[PDB]
Amino acid sequence: RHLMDPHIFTSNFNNGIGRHKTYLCYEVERLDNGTSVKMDQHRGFLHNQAKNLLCGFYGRHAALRFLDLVPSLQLDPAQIYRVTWFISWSPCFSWGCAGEVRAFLQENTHVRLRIFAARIYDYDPLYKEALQMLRDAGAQVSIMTYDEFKHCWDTFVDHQGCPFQPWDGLDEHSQALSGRLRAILQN
DNA sequence: CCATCATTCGATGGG
Ligand SMILES: O=P(O)(O)O[C@H]1[C@H](OP(=O)(O)O)[C@@H](OP(=O)(O)O)[C@H](OP(=O)(O)O)[C@@H](OP(=O)(O)O)[C@H]1OP(=O)(O)O
Ligand SMILES: [Cl-]
Ligand SMILES: [Zn+2]
Structure with missing residues (x-):
């Protein structure tokens, strides 16, 4: 029901460019005898509660x-x-x-x-x-590639019919991050 | 309260 603004997706999920926020898109599937049934009712997205020192609030992560x-x-x-x-x-x-x-x-x-x-x-x-x-x-624990970005665009974003348009460097940044994550998980 | 940053789950500065 609740979908993300296209601008918010492309500004926050760009894998070469940081923002001072965290978005989390989530999906829940039931695992049966062999199969998995997709539970469309159990998907959505949220973001962190921002730090706010005017209230003494040090935030709550996504x-x-x-x-x-x-x-x-x-x-x-x-x-x-x-x-x-x-x-x-x-x-x-x-x-x-x-x-x-x-x-x-x-x-x-x-x-x-x-x-x-x-x-x-x-x-x-x-x-x-x-x-x-x-x-x-x-x-x-994995790095998002083209397939995951395109799935999140298709599933969570208010695209109004607009196909996913990959940003420049998407694949190059996914590979480099993938290499950093593999070195971390080898130990 | 915004605006900026070519923006690390915000820090600043201006008004
Ligand atoms: O069942 P398939 O023949 O593989 O169809 C796939 C599949 O569709 P679903 O998302 O509905 O299952 C992809 O998702 P996966 O199950 O493979 O993860 C989806 O990709 P998105 O999740 O990115 O939307 C993709 O894309 P689309 O629906 O845009 O055609 C679509 O078709 P193709 O893989 O043949 O392009
Ligand atoms: Cl966290
Ligand atoms: Zn945290």
């Missing part, structure tokens, strides 16, 4: 906003689900975000998590430890 909304998803404890995130920045360690996602996965063994990041959040000096902790908790 990943923790997703954990906040999990109860409202009303996932049946008797079924197994795969959650996919398409997140403009990779999850941080230093605010405790990777830790809470790990705790979530340990507490909810019927939920399998897949994360595709557009960009690596290395402003956090412990960014490697975040990506390794999520992998160690059983999350698939």
